Amino acid sequence: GPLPFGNSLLKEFVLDPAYRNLNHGSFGTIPSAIQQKLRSYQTAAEARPCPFLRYQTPVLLDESRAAVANLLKVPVETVVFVANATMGVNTVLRNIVWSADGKDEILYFDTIYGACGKTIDYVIEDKRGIVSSRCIPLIYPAEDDDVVAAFRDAIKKSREEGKRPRLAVIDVVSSMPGVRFPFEDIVKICKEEEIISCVDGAQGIGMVDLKITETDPDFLISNCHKWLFTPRGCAVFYVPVRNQHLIRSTLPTSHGFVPQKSAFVSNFEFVGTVDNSPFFCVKDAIKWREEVLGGEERIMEYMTKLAREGGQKVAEILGTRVLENSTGTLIRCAMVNIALPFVVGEDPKAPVKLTEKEEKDVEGLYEIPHEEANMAFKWMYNVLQDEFNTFVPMTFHRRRFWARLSAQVYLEMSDFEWAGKTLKELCERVAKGEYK
Amino acid sequence: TGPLPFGNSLLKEFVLDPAYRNLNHGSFGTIPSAIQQKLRSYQTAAEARPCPFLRYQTPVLLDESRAAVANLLKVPVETVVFVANATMGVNTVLRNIVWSADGKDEILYFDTIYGACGKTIDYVIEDKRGIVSSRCIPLIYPAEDDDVVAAFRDAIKKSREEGKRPRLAVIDVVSSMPGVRFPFEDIVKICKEEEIISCVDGAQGIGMVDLKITETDPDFLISNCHKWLFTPRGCAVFYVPVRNQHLIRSTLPTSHGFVPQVPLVPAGNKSAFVSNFEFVGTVDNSPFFCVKDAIKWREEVLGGEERIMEYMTKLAREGGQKVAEILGTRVLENSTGTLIRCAMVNIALPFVVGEDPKAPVKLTEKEEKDVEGLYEIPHEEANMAFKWMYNVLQDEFNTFVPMTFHRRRFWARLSAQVYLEMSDFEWAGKTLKELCERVAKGEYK
């Protein structure tokens, strides 16, 4: 029968017992059963290299493609595997052929993952200005209607400057801070305005319902290794058949390229010699999650729930607040952001006006000078690793640090109490100027 | 205390299926048992403390592998980084180059180029929309070194006669199919004299032949550690001299290290170029970490690179010559004896393909003479017998031998290694002879 969740599930994983994984959403981890699968695939790869790697790779790729396509409730013809979410997003932006008039614009939000945003910057440089970008700023906690309105106005203004909004990079769950993004509304608007919806769902599969067929996005990428208990280096690349021809070359270009089972799927099977063992394990992690655990719906339910209550406890212990909007839609995933009980001094080169609510929430709190903000940032990262044997990423947003905690099926309420008491002591020592 | 002897006694150090005979190490390579344990040891550390290890020990272990591989190559440590594979590195070069605005730049390559690399040229032409073109140089094998150099000089000179500008050249160290040593020293020197970017595909390189990087001083060099350096699959070393590192604007894929054009405080640290390759998307970097362990294992246990390379190249010639003797044919070699300057050999199979009048090949007299009396296969059935030989070699004989179809002849490519010996090539001759006798009897059908 399926196992109970919580710390008893640590028996099934291979984490250091002295280390506490409060940041699963960054690199993920795999249970013992999947680690043994991974090494089994490598053993077979080294036993008979050419026979296995040439002819058993496509069989094992298809078995993982079928298992993950059925998880997403999409046709198996629309899914392939790539190294990671960065590789997949690069595969989209590097393949798009932009309009000859040079009016195309890429729309994105300032919460974009750094590597993705820097991919937009390079693509613009590589294409020699045939395409430009429009950065949409977001203030968190962000109401869902305000995000939509910020997207519609960026579309409107882009046309008023004689530009053509061509493609938008849309998050399912954003990275920093870790919040559920209203991607359903943004992709729908991309349809209405004929904008390519490039959905960065790296924080996606295994954690939240992606609603692929319902949302019908032009492209979707999601990290199996983040929240599907898949070995590191595995992202699922979703492309509907209508758009597969736009992916002219894989990344990198390999034997499957055609100069001017479908050809799109066959192209991704061999893209240079790699260890494909993470890809092969996808089918095993899905079956492991369904047989050993209660299944996808039971897993996601526990994590998002633990994320709301765990963060709320951390907020109580710290005397602050979780990051959430009025509709309670930011914490619709396994990650939650809690403000730290201090404030950073204003930066003279880029002063940030605070709303009345934000400035009210910081009085009585210790203030760090802005010149020491980066110094305090490093000190907190080092201390959490060396003295507390954990890691907590922190988003610097509007003169405040928001700690991101990741719930998991092997965590429980006591873990978020420890995180609350840990961060509390950490911030008390920051208040005493221990970072110097 | 001495280094371990070579041959089948060395198989106990590897993890090959004892029933499987690996005559094709040059395609995917393999690793000794000790290195596979290192790979899994790095995996365990990654899952024990993911964030502390993957963020802060990754650059440390990369730096140890970079220093270890730089000393083997005898290059400055700042000129080497690690990328996923050879198909990743050549792409990194061809996609970062900024082509002349006038549209006269063209890329010159030989028709023995690796298939993925050739199509990488085709796509970059398509992606960059005709502002760069390509010029393919056909090669006839066995090719004399002077003739290769001659065709390169003729294509450069010709190139300019159509108002084009030869800008970059893709140059092999050891070509894939057929597996032969290429005169890259001459071609790279000619690229400097003619001001052409030398992009050296040395995937068949490190661990097998002396790359002579400092002597060659190429513009870009790439080589697969997982092919001939006993490194786990998914590892190629990317060599760029500091003078050319600014030309690599973005890694593949683009990641946090990319700096947009249009202040600093670098201090005296790792260069931006080297830092850029440390995090280019989340991957299992365990193969990269094992580079220092593989190089050390080869030095301590096997006696070093020179002893390893010298045995494999000697076994290639003599082993290949016995396969040719058993088959009654020949090895692929020119008058200069420089093709078999590696651990791979090509031996012609004792039959000939019927001529295809779609692309009829005009053979020399030495091809007329050497095919006289041999059983001829009709050209309809060349591909049919090609696939049938592959399946039988795997299903009946439990091995794999890749074959180049070149000028109405098949050349089986064999790979020598430290765990193989003379008896293995005798088995290859016996197997290939039994295989070709059954092809003459038309068993493929």
Rounded Cα gap, residues A11 and A23, in angstroms: 19
Report CB contact under 8 Å: A249, B123: yes
| Interacting residues of B356 by C-beta distance below 8 A, sequence separation 6+ | B379
Report CB contact under 8 Å: A50, B28: yes
Rounded Cα gap, residues B441 and A257, in angstroms: 37
B274 touches chain A (CB under 8 A): no
Which whole-number Å values give the CA distances from A87 to A93, B280, B330, in the listed order? 10, 9, 46
Report CB contact under 8 Å: B123, A259: yes
Which DSSP letter does residue B362 get? -
Burial (0-12, 13-18, 19+ Cβ within 10 Å), A377 = middle
Which whole-number Å values give the CA distances from B268 to B143, B272, B278, in the listed order? 48, 11, 18
Q: For residue A23, what is the nearest residue in chain B, using CA coordinates?
A: B51
Which DSSP letter does residue B331 get? B
B 206-225 residues with CB below 8 A of A?
224
Report CB contact under 8 Å: B281, A121: no
> Bridge-partner residues for B412, per DSSP?
B347, B403
**The residue to which tokens 């949302």 are assigned:** A215
* Cα atoms in the Cβ-side hemisphere of radius 13 Å centred on A321: 11
Supply φ then ψ for residue A108, to 5 degrees: -155, 170
Supply φ then ψ for residue B24, to 5 degrees: -130, 60
CB B308 within 8 A of CB B53: no
End-to-end CA distance of chain A: 53
Rounded Cα gap, residues B316 and B416, in angstroms: 5
Q: How near does any CA of chain B get to the CA of A158, in Å? A: 22
- Which value in Å is the resolution of this experimental model? 2.3
| Interacting residues of B291 by C-beta distance below 8 A, sequence separation 6+ | B65, B68, B69, B82, B225, B229, B231, B235, B237
Q: How near does any CA of chain A get to the CA of B297, in Å? A: 18
B 324-343 residues with CB below 8 A of A?
none
Rounded Cα gap, residues B317 and B323, in angstroms: 10
> Bridge-partner residues for B347, per DSSP?
B331, B412
Q: For residue A83, what is the nearest residue in chain B, using CA coordinates?
A: B283
Task: Report the residue of B47, B58, B120, B417 to disrupt the A interface, i.e. the one with the largest count of A CBs within 10 Å.
Answer: B47
Reading the block at residue B49, the tokens are 């403390």
Which whole-number Å values give the CA distances from B160 to B149, B163, B181, B191, B201, in the listed order? 17, 5, 29, 14, 24
Instruction: Transcribe A160-177 into DSSP letters.
Output: HTT-EEEEEEEESB-SSS
Supply φ then ψ for residue B76, to 5 degrees: -60, 140
End-to-end CA distance of chain B: 55
Q: Which chain B residues are Cβ-neighbours of A53 within 8 angstroms?
A: 28
Q: How near does any CA of chain A get to the CA of B180, in Å? A: 20
Q: Which chain B residues are Cβ-neighbours of A21 within 8 angstroms?
A: 50
| The one-letter amino acid at A273 | T
A245 touches chain B (CB under 8 A): no
Tell me whether the omega of the peptide bond preceding residue B253 falls within 30 degrees of 0, making it cis.
yes
Reading the block at residue B90, the tokens are 């050549």
Report CB contact under 8 Å: A251, B252: yes
B119 touches chain A (CB under 8 A): yes
CA neighbor of B282 nearest in space, from A267, A126, A224: A224
Rounded Cα gap, residues A172 and A202, in angstroms: 8
Reading the block at residue A247, the tokens are 């992916």
Please state the length of chain A: 436
Supply φ then ψ for residue A48, to 5 degrees: -135, 85
Rounded Cα gap, residues B169 and B219, in angstroms: 10
Q: Which chain A residues are Cβ-neighbours of B39 within 8 angstroms?
A: 42
CB B65 within 8 A of CB B291: yes
CA neighbor of B80 nearest in space, from B255, B208, B233, B271: B271
Q: For residue B46, what is the nearest residue in chain A, using CA coordinates?
A: A29
Rounded Cα gap, residues B115 and B90, in angstroms: 12
Reading the block at residue B192, the tokens are 């400097």
Q: Which chain A residues are Cβ-neighbours of B389 within 8 angstroms?
A: none
Burial (0-12, 13-18, 19+ Cβ within 10 Å), A189 = middle
A 350-389 residues with CB below 8 A of B?
385, 389
CB B203 within 8 A of CB B223: yes
Helix (H, G, I), strand (E, B) or coil at B164: coil
Q: How near does any CA of chain B get to the CA of A47, in Å? A: 4
CB B108 within 8 A of CB B247: no
CB B201 within 8 A of CB B173: yes
Report CB contact under 8 Å: B284, A233: yes
B48 touches chain A (CB under 8 A): yes
Report CB contact under 8 Å: A90, B234: no
CA neighbor of B21 nearest in space, from B432, B442, B440: B432
Rounded Cα gap, residues B400 and B419, in angstroms: 16
Instruction: Transcribe B94-140 into DSSP letters.
Output: HHHPPPPTTS-EEEEEETTS-HHHHHHHHHHHHHTTTSSEEEEE---
Domain boundaries, chain B: 1-302, 303-445
Strand extents, DSSP E, B186-270: 197-201, 220-224, 236-239
Q: Which helix (H) or strand (E) holds A367?
A: strand A366-368
CA neighbor of B358 nearest in space, from B391, B382, B338, B340: B382
Reading the block at residue A12, the tokens are 């099934």
Burial (0-12, 13-18, 19+ Cβ within 10 Å), B131 = middle
CA angle B242, B245, B248 (to 5 degrees): 170
Which DSSP letter does residue B261 get? -
Alpha helices in B256-340 (DSSP H): 272-276, 286-289, 291-300, 305-327
| The one-letter amino acid at A20 | R
Q: Which chain B residues are Cβ-neighbours of A83 within 8 angstroms?
A: 84, 281, 283
Report CB contact under 8 Å: A45, B233: yes
Instruction: Transcribe A200-216 into DSSP letters.
Output: E-TTTTTTS---HHHH-
In this structure, how many other beta carbons lie within 10 angstroms of the beta carbon of residue A129?
Answer: 8
B403 touches chain A (CB under 8 A): no
CB B143 within 8 A of CB B335: no
Rounded Cα gap, residues A217 and A197, in angstroms: 6
Report CB contact under 8 Å: B284, A232: yes
Report CB contact under 8 Å: B84, A83: yes
CA angle A333, A337, A339 (to 5 degrees): 165
Rounded Cα gap, residues A157 and A391, in angstroms: 41
B41 touches chain A (CB under 8 A): no
Of A46, A115, A248, the CB nearest to B254: A115
- How many Cβ contacts (< 8 angstroms) between chains A and B? 195
Does the CA dihedral B248-B252-B257-B262 come out positive or negative?
A: positive
In this structure, how many other beta carbons lie within 10 angstroms of the beta carbon of residue B427?
Answer: 16
Rounded Cα gap, residues A314 and A419, in angstroms: 7
B395 touches chain A (CB under 8 A): no
CB B43 within 8 A of CB A21: no
Which DSSP letter does residue A232 get? S
Which whole-number Å values give the CA distances from B343 to A337, B4, B306, B350, in the listed order? 57, 19, 13, 22
In this structure, how many other beta carbons lie within 10 angstroms of the beta carbon of residue B332?
Answer: 25
Burial (0-12, 13-18, 19+ Cβ within 10 Å), B359 = exposed
Report CB contact under 8 Å: B44, A14: yes
Long-range (24+ apart) CB contacts under 8 A made by A3-10 are: A3/A292, A3/A293, A5/A293, A5/A302, A5/A409, A5/A410, A5/A412, A6/A409, A6/A410, A6/A411, A6/A412, A7/A410, A7/A411, A7/A412, A7/A414, A7/A415, A9/A409, A9/A410, A10/A410
Report CB contact under 8 Å: B43, A53: no
Of A122, A231, A391, the CB nearest to B250: A122
Rounded Cα gap, residues B357 and B379, in angstroms: 10
CB B290 within 8 A of CB B39: yes
